[PDB]
């Protein structure tokens, strides 16, 4: 019934495990427990009633070599609360190692996707043998943090007591999930997606525009594009001939009379935008993404379709999955074809507006409407789930 979640020292972390705290609280009444440094912990100090919020503590020296001292912190705080069960991060290394300490059940959450995480696992249980699904990854033509990544990952998938969380869903990566289970021979359970006075103007324009007719294009924090990849995806938005909203992120670079040449049918936001907002709008049709699994979460939860442009890390190999189940397409590469006018331009027209993509916005609807078919009920199994692997443990000798 009490449960306790230590979520790794990085924002993109936070808040998934928030919003299972969310989720977990307003169901059986979970005594929930998270904790974090409280530099991570105040950014969700809105509308969090149902959950309980710790702090954690370290001291300096004369996040990197703090992490890997403040464990005693981490036991002191467990052996003070005495938790029934902990849900930990990829990156906590000794949380894993507490849990067997105290005796208490470590139950591992993936905030990433079953497909990727297969293909890693696959490797490490079969070095010799090639990917079950060819279709996703070609282990034939090219296999030439190190090997303390791979580790990382291999504890955090075995230390995981009987149950692994993945944020994920059966509708999306079933045939992954099953196989990530039988590969880590840890049953994976489900938990489904997971969810200020300069927003009403994006707002007041969207709500002028049609159904299904306005293209949404944030490629995230970090790996900012240079001006000249900036000057492609313009100008593919510029020849698109459909309506757009574009957020882009120290030295200010921009393209130089971009903006004016485009006049209206376009709004160029410079921090954060409503994402989930102008997702969740009627008006809105196509979701030009950098296929973050987060972001590929809430476009899938509204129905969206998505245009790839993945470049670095998983989100190739999420956003190829989009394009598996047909509710994305991916953009053509040449050496480096990720900015360039004409295939995003094609593939924009070919989503929004044109008859060719139809089948991805049909498949984009049909599957977003299952999402709220059987919400709520995989966090109810996951939550039963959890109070058996509790009762389980209830073990004297
Ligand atoms: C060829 C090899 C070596 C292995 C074969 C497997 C493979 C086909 O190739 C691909 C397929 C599976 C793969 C994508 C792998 C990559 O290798 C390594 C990634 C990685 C560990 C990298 C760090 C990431 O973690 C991010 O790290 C960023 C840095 O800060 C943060 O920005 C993010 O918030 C944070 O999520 C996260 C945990 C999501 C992923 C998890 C999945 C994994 C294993």
Same mark, same amino acid.
């Given at each position: 019934?009490?449960?306790? %979640?230590?979520?790794?020292?990085?924002?993109?972390?936070?808040?998934?495990?928030?919003?299972?705290?969310?989720?977990?609280?307003?169901?059986?009444?979970?005594?929930?427990?998270? /904790?974090?440094?409280?530099?991570?912990?105040?950014?969700?100090?809105?509308?969090?009633?149902?959950?309980?919020?710790?702090?954690?503590?370290?001291?300096?020296?004369? %996040?990197?070599?703090?992490?890997?001292?403040?464990?005693?912190?981490?036991?002191?705080?467990?052996?003070?609360?005495?938790?029934?069960?902990?849900?930990?991060?990829?990156?906590?290394?000794?949380?894993?190692?507490?849990?067997?300490?105290?005796?208490?059940?470590?139950?591992?959450?993936?905030?990433?996707?079953?497909?990727?995480?297969?293909?890693?696992?696959?490797?490490?249980?079969?070095?010799?043998?090639?990917?079950?699904?060819?279709?996703?990854?070609?282990?034939?033509?090219?296999?030439?943090?190190?090997?303390?990544? %791979?580790?990382?990952?291999?504890?955090?998938?075995?230390?995981?007591?009987?149950? $692994?969380?993945?944020?994920?869903?059966?509708?999306?990566?079933?045939?992954?999930?099953?196989?990530?289970?039988?590969?880590?021979?840890?049953?994976?359970?489900?938990?489904?997606?997971?969810?200020?006075?300069?927003?009403?103007?994006?707002?007041?324009?969207?709500?002028?525009?049609?159904? /299904?007719?306005?293209?949404?294009?944030?490629?995230?924090?970090?790996?900012?594009?240079?001006?000249?990849?900036?000057?492609?995806?313009?100008?593919?938005?510029?020849?698109?001939?459909?309506?757009?909203?574009?957020?882009?992120?120290?030295?200010?670079?921009?393209?130089?009379?971009?903006?004016?040449?485009?006049?209206?049918?376009?709004?160029?936001?410079?921090?954060?935008?409503?994402?989930?907002?102008?997702?969740?709008?009627?008006?809105?049709?196509?979701?030009?993404?950098?296929?973050?699994?987060? /972001? $590929?979460?809430?476009?899938?939860?509204?129905?969206?379709?998505?245009?790839?442009?993945?470049?670095?890390?998983?989100?190739?190999?999420?956003?190829?999955?989009?394009?598996?189940?047909?509710?994305?397409?991916?953009?053509?590469?040449?050496?480096?074809?990720?900015?360039?006018?004409?295939?995003?331009?094609?593939?924009?027209?070919?989503?929004?507006?044109?008859?060719?993509?139809?089948?991805?916005?049909?498949?984009?609807?049909?599957?977003?409407?299952?999402?709220?078919?059987?919400?709520?009920?995989?966090?109810?199994?996951?939550?039963?789930?959890?109070?058996?692997?509790?009762?389980?443990?209830?073990?004297?000798?």
């Amino acid at each position: 019934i009490s449960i306790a %979640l230590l979520p790794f020292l990085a924002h993109g972390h936070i808040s998934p495990f928030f919003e299972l705290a969310k989720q977990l609280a307003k169901r059986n009444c979970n005594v929930f427990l998270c /904790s974090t440094p409280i530099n991570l912990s105040s950014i969700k100090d809105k509308d969090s009633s149902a959950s309980i919020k710790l702090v954690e503590l370290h001291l300096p020296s004369s %996040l990197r070599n703090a992490f890997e001292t403040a464990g005693p912190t981490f036991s002191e705080i467990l052996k003070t609360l005495n938790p029934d069960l902990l849900i930990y991060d990829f990156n906590p290394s000794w949380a894993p190692e507490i849990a067997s300490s105290h005796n208490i059940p470590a139950v591992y959450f993936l905030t990433t996707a079953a497909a990727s995480s297969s293909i890693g696992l696959h490797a490490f249980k079969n070095p010799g043998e090639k990917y079950p699904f060819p279709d996703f990854y070609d282990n034939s033509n090219i296999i030439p943090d190190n090997m303390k990544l %791979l580790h990382d990952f291999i504890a955090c998938f075995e230390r995981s007591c009987d149950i $692994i969380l993945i944020k994920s869903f059966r509708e999306l990566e079933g045939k992954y999930i099953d196989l990530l289970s039988t590969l880590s021979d840890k049953t994976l359970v489900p938990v489904g997606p997971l969810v200020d006075p300069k927003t009403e103007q994006i707002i007041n324009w969207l709500d002028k525009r049609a159904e /299904s007719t306005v293209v949404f294009v944030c490629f995230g924090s970090e790996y900012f594009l240079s001006n000249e990849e900036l000057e492609e995806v313009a100008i593919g938005l510029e020849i698109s001939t459909v309506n757009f909203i574009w957020a882009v992120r120290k030295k200010g670079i921009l393209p130089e009379g971009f903006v004016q040449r485009v006049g209206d049918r376009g709004l160029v936001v410079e921090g954060w935008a409503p994402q989930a907002r102008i997702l969740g709008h009627s008006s809105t049709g196509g979701f030009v993404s950098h296929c973050g699994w987060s /972001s $590929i979460a809430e476009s899938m939860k509204f129905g969206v379709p998505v245009i790839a442009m993945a470049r670095h890390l998983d989100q190739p190999l999420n956003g190829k999955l989009a394009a598996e189940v047909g509710v994305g397409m991916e953009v053509v590469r040449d050496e480096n074809g990720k900015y360039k006018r004409e295939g995003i331009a094609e593939v924009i027209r070919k989503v929004v507006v044109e008859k060719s993509g139809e089948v991805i916005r049909r498949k984009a609807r049909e599957l977003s409407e299952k999402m709220k078919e059987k919400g709520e009920q995989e966090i109810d199994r996951a939550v039963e789930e959890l109070v058996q692997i509790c009762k389980k443990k209830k073990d004297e000798q």
